[PDB]
Amino acid sequence: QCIWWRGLQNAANVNQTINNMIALNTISYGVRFLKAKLCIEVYAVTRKRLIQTGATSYYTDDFEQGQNLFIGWADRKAESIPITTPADLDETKLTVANTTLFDANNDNITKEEVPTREKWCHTWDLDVLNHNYLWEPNNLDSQWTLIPGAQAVQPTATPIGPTYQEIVIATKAIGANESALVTTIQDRRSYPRLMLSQPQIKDETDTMKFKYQIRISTELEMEHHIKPDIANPWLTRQTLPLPALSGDGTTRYVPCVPYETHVSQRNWNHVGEYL
Amino acid sequence: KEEVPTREKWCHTWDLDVLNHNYLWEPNNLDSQWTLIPGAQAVQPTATPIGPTYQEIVIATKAIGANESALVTTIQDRRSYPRLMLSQPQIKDETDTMKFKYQIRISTELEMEHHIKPDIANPWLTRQTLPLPALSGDGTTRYVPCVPYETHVSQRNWNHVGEYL
Amino acid sequence: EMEHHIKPDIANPWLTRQTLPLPALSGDGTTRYVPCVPYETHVSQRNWNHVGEYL
Amino acid sequence: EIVIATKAIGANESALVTTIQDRRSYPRLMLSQPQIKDETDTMKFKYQIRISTEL
Amino acid sequence: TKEGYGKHITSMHVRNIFNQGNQVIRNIVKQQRYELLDFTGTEAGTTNLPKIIPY
Amino acid sequence: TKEGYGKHITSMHVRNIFNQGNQVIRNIVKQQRYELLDFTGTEAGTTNLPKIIPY
DNA sequence: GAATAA
DNA sequence: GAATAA
DNA sequence: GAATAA
DNA sequence: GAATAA
DNA sequence: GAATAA
DNA sequence: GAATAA
């Protein structure tokens, strides 16, 4: 939902692909995120085996190749990632309290579980955008900034704005003397919440503790539409700003709505009442 | 006019699905009058604005509580809804008109697909929901608009134009 | 060339629904700069081809 | 199998609802562990599972 | 080896059996009404005047 | 003669548009539940004993 | 019946 | 038009 | 001419 | 694209 | 979808 | 199996 594809959670994660990107965001009037493919690779599934005699515990980590990392999808429930800092978003240290892929009652998670030597690859098509438009050229240094989507749910505190709704109506400045009523329609993308969690297994004391050695692999297709050969500040017409959260809030909850329901334009069939 | 004699019925069907791109109208108990059938009709009073849902291209903000919002935003096809009336022949008698009173049974049945809730709370699901074209205002009396027709205009260039160009 | 779509045979002030005002500049400015933007760039909804990285 | 019952319908009326239906033996169902004698009684197994029951 | 016997049993694929919030119920509001149209009166809606259907 | 003009108009046959009380809605109660089966305990339902599914 | 004949 | 679009 | 040669 | 869309 | 849409 | 049996 956010953009960690630049790998913000540590500034140590920059590769020329990020650098190539920055130089393109300089020479570009606008951009599209065309496709985003994520591939998790699980090298190990390792629980901490807790051997407890009364009033003592022996700890050892042990490989479980009969267990696997659960990649959860929240497709039944409205949920949000809290975001504060570029570090606050990390595939590891990022969490929400009282959250479990396993509820004793209604398990709202569609899970995809990967064992050792199996990978979870998932691709998102980030081109939501129709009618010869683009997203503004952007260096992704800014967190609380969201992947291309028409998702309709914004907080009152940090409104994402028209770019976030399906039908975009916005005003780009073009300096003081001019304006652009950049105005497009785009297809709606529900982006659920995604999680990497362990099996919940009650041990004698609470849960078993699993820690997964993995390699996430996240690669992001972008067509950087580079600048004209001649200045056109008036070219922002077909550029849109990203669905970045705007506000003073230090912490910002980036929305995840699981699904876009299908409704019909079709009339009925097999309705008994004759009309 | 469409005139019905005794043992003849006037049946007329309206297709109230005006709505495109995977949207819906809010769930509504119709107890509220000054509330209008689905339409993209463009004419609203200044006193009781119907709002974006009423114009063809909808741009609206649904609350989703305080912390969130939804810029529900759709396009929909325009429906002119004329005014409909049941009246008598006007026949001058020696004194003013003849007075007719019709025994009739109106029969009004309305198809609705109620898209029921998710199996899990999504206050953020109002994205594809729209509020009805209900009139909003303090006005005790409210004039609900009827515009007879949506004129057809062409994207076609001319033909049989004498000037050569 | 103009198709002047003439009025209804009956008043419909509510017919402006499908009418739009022109892109006339509005303001007090005696001099007004009418914008000319040379081109509308073409961008693709197409994914790539002949990209060497396998994915 | 053959139902003969009286539904009230209030005080003034009754319904001798009366049907036939096919017989269903429903056994008992259980989730248990292997019984394995250890040095002390049985081994103790505890299963992490998700039941999924839809009706 | 991980293997076990069962009936209507399968290797466990993705299962989330809650719909992604897509479901549609259809009722028709049905409101037949016998009515009268009285133009014979002087009172309010009873007059020479056309009586309206506010669809 | 009894005659009149109209559209979607017909000689009036039998119309009662209320159903004779035949209508069927279908939901599936869906109750996925992650659960534990603990035989490691001495307390109540945690024992060597088979745990029951009361369908 | 490039000069407007639907 | 396993995530209910009759 | 999974390691980007349009 | 009887309710005028050359 | 001579004005760079791989 | 105009009176709603997907």
Residue numbers in the entry:
A (entry chain A): 102 to 376
B (entry chain A): 212 to 376
C (entry chain A): 322 to 376
D (entry chain A): 267 to 321
E (entry chain A), F (entry chain A): 47 to 101
Provide excerpts from the study:
Our structural and molecular examinations revealed that the AdSDV packages one genome segment per particle. The AdSDV capsid displayed an overall “smooth” capsid surface with the only protruding area surrounding the fivefold symmetry axis.
The vpORF1 sequence could be modeled into the FC density map from Thr47 to Leu377, the final C-terminal residue. The AdSDV is the first parvovirus, where the “density column”, occupying the fivefold channel of the FC fraction, harbors a direct connection to the ordered N-terminus, confirming that N-terminal externalization is a conserved mechanism and independent from the presence of a functional PLA2. Each subunit interacts with the C-terminal tail of the fivefold neighbor to their twofold neighboring subunit. The ordered density of six nucleotides per each FC subunit occupies the interior twofold axis. The AdSDV FC structure displayed the highest number of ordered nucleotides thus far, which directly interact with the interior capsid surface.
